[model samples]
Target: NAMMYFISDTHFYHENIINLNPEVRFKGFEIVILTNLLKVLKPEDTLYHLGDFTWHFNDKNEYLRIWKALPGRKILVMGNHDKDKESLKEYFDEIYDFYKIIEHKGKRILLSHYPAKDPITERYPDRQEMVREIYFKENCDLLIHGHVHWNREGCACKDYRIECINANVEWNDYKPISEREIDKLI
Candidate 1:
């Protein structure tokens, strides 16, 4: 089976993330995401990190080191914070500006950095309603996304237009989840 893997919102070296998720220590997070990926990722695999792979990378070489150490080919779906395409392009096998779709096992899976809508938050304070419209308009079996960082303010609607899977590392024990697991959810 050529099932793909996915993880998102891995804000490596982003101190703000540490403050928000106080339980997650700064340097420890680096080890967690890498070790977790190594736990299951094979050399032949392609792990799709949806967005926010990192933001506060003070040292480019350190970032380079982590990218090289990661298991398998990496594809990035650019998020709001993701920048320096050329630098990232060197390491990532592929990089997408916004979103992408691939059908696996007859399932049309939509890969994106942002959710169709923020279930708990519509979402965020200065969110662009148009952005949600763009994703929500897509016809797919499942929309897998990240960006909420696993923190929701309050209640959200149960029956939405499309089924969603939040691929944030925090939600999935910091490991990259395979398509086989995603398929089972549906």
Candidate 2:
């Protein structure tokens, strides 16, 4: 089986120095991690960026340049912060909406940028209920997303459990989910 990598919540540029400080450089960490990740990847390996790849929609060109610098075939799961899909088409092999049901290792998986609303935050009336409604109905084995940068503790919904892994790797102090670990799901 091919190795797989998944990442999200990389607020690459937010126009705020605090967000991109060199000393606490979360983006730098991502870059360093990515550089290392590329070494282990085979040509057939796949990488998935869950969301918030960059802060500026207009600066997509810059983001694309950096994205292409990385290794492996990349797929983007567009986040709420992302702009138009047409603009990013040149960068990624495939791009999907904020929420989707995908299959990996014969396991049904659900992906999104925001945590599915829990009992306390049972989704605003108008917003689509991602976790409780669609994901649960589909019998998804895993739910991965990024939006709440600091919150890594995922919640359960509708008889299905979830692992809420925010993509803010540096801020949250976590290691990436490796290919070997993901292989079991497939």
Candidate 3:
């Protein structure tokens, strides 16, 4: 059966990511990420990648090589580090800038590269406060995102009445997560 998967911050080919998390090196992170993905996904499956798919690739083929190897029709939500837009389209079926609202099994989900937060209420911030508010106002039941790395775990906020999930590679065992798993998280 075909399944839907969500993942982000793969950061493929970014050597510094390994430095940030030594665990990646110990786990053979790149291969583990790829192997886990291949195990769960068939060509018929769909993958929603929240963003930062890769970094600083001088050669397009390097990106394409990994892109072609992966199974699924990939949809990307653009990240701060995701550049070279025209070239990226070749890999993703669809790409959204900043954020997108998607429906899954009758559930409305807000997808973004960054976690959802009330920027106006929070005094100092590291991300785009305005856009985060826009996404929050959309009032999706759930928000699935990345870019926080390992700093924050998943949480449910009564104030927002929304469940926020971080799907960063660092926390997900360097693999894409299935819809069933996401449901369990919420």
Candidate 4:
């Protein structure tokens, strides 16, 4: 069986590439992963990018080029850092604003940049909770997001069932999640 890759939080910056971690900087370690993915992924495999793919940069073409080189059908869930949606039009098969509802294998999924919270506290908190509400209260089988890089605490509204899938490559240190592990959820 083919594997579906989910990655996010690269935060690629065309100008200030020096500041980011050397592994994640523009055309850094991601290039190797991209090449491996293209080699292993079948044309039918699907890839979902949660958010923060690139940092603020004027040269959107540079970023788009890197993303376009990857294989599989790409879906972009706009994050806090991503801009120039028009530039990404050709790179992604579909682009979603903030969130998009999708179905896979009879399961409802919620794709978003930020996870929702209950009361909407501070900036980061509010963003996180938005995901919570959308998934838990909205009845999504899975909630996928990328904002909180290292944070991990599952939360859902009353009587709601949604599993948060954090796609930050750094969270797992760039390792791909195997579908064999995910199939256990089914």
* Better-scoring candidate (TM-score), 2 or 4: 4
Query: What's the candidate order when arranged by decreasing TM-score?
Result: 1, 3, 4, 2
- Residue lDDT tens for model 3, 81-141: 8987787887788999878887777777888877655322432245545445756677577
- In order, the Cα lDDT scores of the candidates are 0.72, 0.60, 0.72, 0.63
Q: How close to the true structure is residue 111 of candidate 2, measured as C-alpha lDDT?
A: 69
List model 2 lDDT by residue over 47-143, tens digit each: 7777777666565435447667666787888876788787778768888876766687687767676666443353432332655466668877767
Candidate 3 residue 58 Cα shift, in angstroms, is: 4.0
Model 2 misplaced stretches (Cα beyond 4 Å): 15-30, 57-63, 118-128, 151-164, 171-175, 183-186
Question: Model 1: per-residue lDDT, tens digit, 1-186?
Answer: 344899998887776777777654455676778777767877878889899877754655375576667668889998888988876786688998888887777777878887766666554424324334544665567777887666533212125566677788877778888887876866
Instruction: Give the lowest summed-lDDT range of ten residues in model 1.
Output: 151-160
Per TM-score, the best of the predicted structures is 1
Q: Can you rank all candidates by lDDT, best first?
A: 1, 3, 4, 2
- TM-score (C-alpha) between model 3 and the true structure: 0.81
Count of clashes in candidate 4: 9
Which ranges of candidate 3 are over 4 A from the true structure?
Answer: 23-28, 59-64, 118-132, 151-160
Model 4 segments beyond 4 Å from truth? 1-3, 14-27, 56-63, 116-122, 151-162, 176-178
